Symmetry: C4
Subunit: 196 residues, 4 copies
Amino acid sequence: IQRYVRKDGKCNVHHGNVRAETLVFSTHAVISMRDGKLCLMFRVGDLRNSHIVEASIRAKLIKSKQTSEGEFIPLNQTDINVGYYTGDDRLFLVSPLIISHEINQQSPFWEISKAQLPKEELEIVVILEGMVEATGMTCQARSSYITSEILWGYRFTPVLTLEDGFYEVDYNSFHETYETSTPSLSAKELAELANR
Amino acid sequence: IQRYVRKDGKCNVHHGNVRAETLVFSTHAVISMRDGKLCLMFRVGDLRNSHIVEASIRAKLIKSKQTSEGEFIPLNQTDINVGYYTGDDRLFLVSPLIISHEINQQSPFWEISKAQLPKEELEIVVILEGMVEATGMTCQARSSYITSEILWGYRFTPVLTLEDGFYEVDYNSFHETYETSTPSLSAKELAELANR
Amino acid sequence: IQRYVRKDGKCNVHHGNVRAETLVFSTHAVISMRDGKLCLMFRVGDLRNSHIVEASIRAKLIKSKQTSEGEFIPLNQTDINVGYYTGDDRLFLVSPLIISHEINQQSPFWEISKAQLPKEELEIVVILEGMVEATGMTCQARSSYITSEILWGYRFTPVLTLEDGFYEVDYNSFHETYETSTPSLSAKELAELANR
Amino acid sequence: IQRYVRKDGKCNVHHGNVRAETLVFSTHAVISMRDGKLCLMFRVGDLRNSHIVEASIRAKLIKSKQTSEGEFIPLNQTDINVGYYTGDDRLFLVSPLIISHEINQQSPFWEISKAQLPKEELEIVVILEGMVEATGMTCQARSSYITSEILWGYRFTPVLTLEDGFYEVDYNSFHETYETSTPSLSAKELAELANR
Ligand SMILES: [Ba+2]
């Protein structure tokens, strides 16, 4: 077994790195099953020449809404769960990671099917926050996924390969995704159906 | 659909901004229903020429009290829930936001009606904390709402409009509020009544 | 009603302050009832000439212990709950505050009576952490309470008084405490007794 | 009773310290019972000549996996619970500490027995994060434990001794461990067995 991180803390990625260049999120996001739960996932990249300490990820849902009392909220924000409750939003970014938001009863996508999706008017803001080790300072990097940019029933291509006691990232594959069998029911719908 | 945040992370607000000037909270706060829950809301502004990273909001209730054992606490503090449990207190401040505190059993306003309000001796301290991107440093901004400054049964006027592929903020409307039909019972009272 | 914090964020404490000097905890800590719950409380002071942003408080229990399997832990640490779950450990330090730890089933003092106390071999480490506004940097301040320094059945004297539209702190009273009727049973004991 | 931390905040460790040198984790990690729960523990050292403020610890499990739907995740990460929920991951590092992760239903080691262990292909990444008081800046220190480096049924040797009103650390013992009677069943197995 070849290690990912060595005893002294130095990682075994990007052979001959030196741990501005900017961080990248995948251009699209995907939705598909993982151990029987429907998930939304987007890929967040790393920085080729330094770690990001106290790194964390969050997401906001931007969607205008009307409260049952007629109050209309343009571009309302609501937090999307991507690990906050278990500290899985506290990232160890040393290679591109697939962030996953399980679509459960408390997710805003709970009632959105595949057909329902391209009709909805919404945007997901993805915000990475950490301290650039080398730089000393607090960075923030943002990106955005609009409806048309969320691909139902796809999955992210892997980019990680072990080569000669070092792990290397084929950054070409970063944004690439492939298709997989995926039900077109809504999370909610899937849940009711399984519940009988 | 015109985006709020572009793929590269640059927002589409305040056409031709350059992302000291000071942040502003609304002068008053309002109380009114949102999807059948009574809420207290105050508006928190943004900074016209920079983001605030790791931005977060909290509120303290200042009200002198007497413990059942006679211990009198002058200006006692207790935390007001404004998203802490779900990370909705972690703000993405790129335009004035309405912060909302749902008045539930664990809120201090649970037993305060409309008539009861102007009688109570209390103050809400609102504290924004984040890192000014441009400046590098940790800022804090504070404000305060006393009883007379909490308007029962009102709502905040919207200030957000889409113009020419950019969203613009009519800062005149920032502090302005309007009236809406709102029961004058206390949260607690409303709850009991609905519970039968 | 005279405000504690003004609309522009400036507080109304310490008339003519300018918002190194060091922060002070009370020399002793006290234990006594608050709304029918037994509490341990110590007082944490403020800094006369600046705020402390992102201020937070925590406490550690240092007590050597033996695991049921004979493993002996010298000076074992375990966290004492002082608001962590509700964000009441996130302080708004603009005048000396009484920090309170409710002694419940999950507290380490759950089974410690008044008589039992002076026999136990333990220490409470109190750690304040925040960013000194003026200084720019992250401070930490520590103190410690050993058994003999925890006064059962006392309460903290108030130090806060309103004078001429400003609130002033009689720093003489800071460490002073007085006595109050307080049962000498353990929290656990009190609980069982009330439970019948 | 000789104190660990003095009233003024100065600790009573490392007689004549001055509160780069690098922090050290133990070379191995151990698994063994503590009050009837099976735990995984590794030791994290302190820094001989300065405190680490806002110090915190986290751990990641790196293990490649296949989702029930065939999606294969190379070097998947998942957070290991080491105090996050109760703030026991917020460390008071003034002498080497044994960090403990209780192996419960939500731990990834729930179904891993002693025999099962050396077969599994996994790695634990341990990440300390804090602010070096003297330095002003945010540090991160990392280490790693692979299967062969996790010793089933051992415990950490104590290194802490009281000498002349000061506590001293025999840094020789730091990495040393000894054996203890320890069941070779999996946590899960132990649980089922006790549940009847
Ligand atoms: Ba920080």
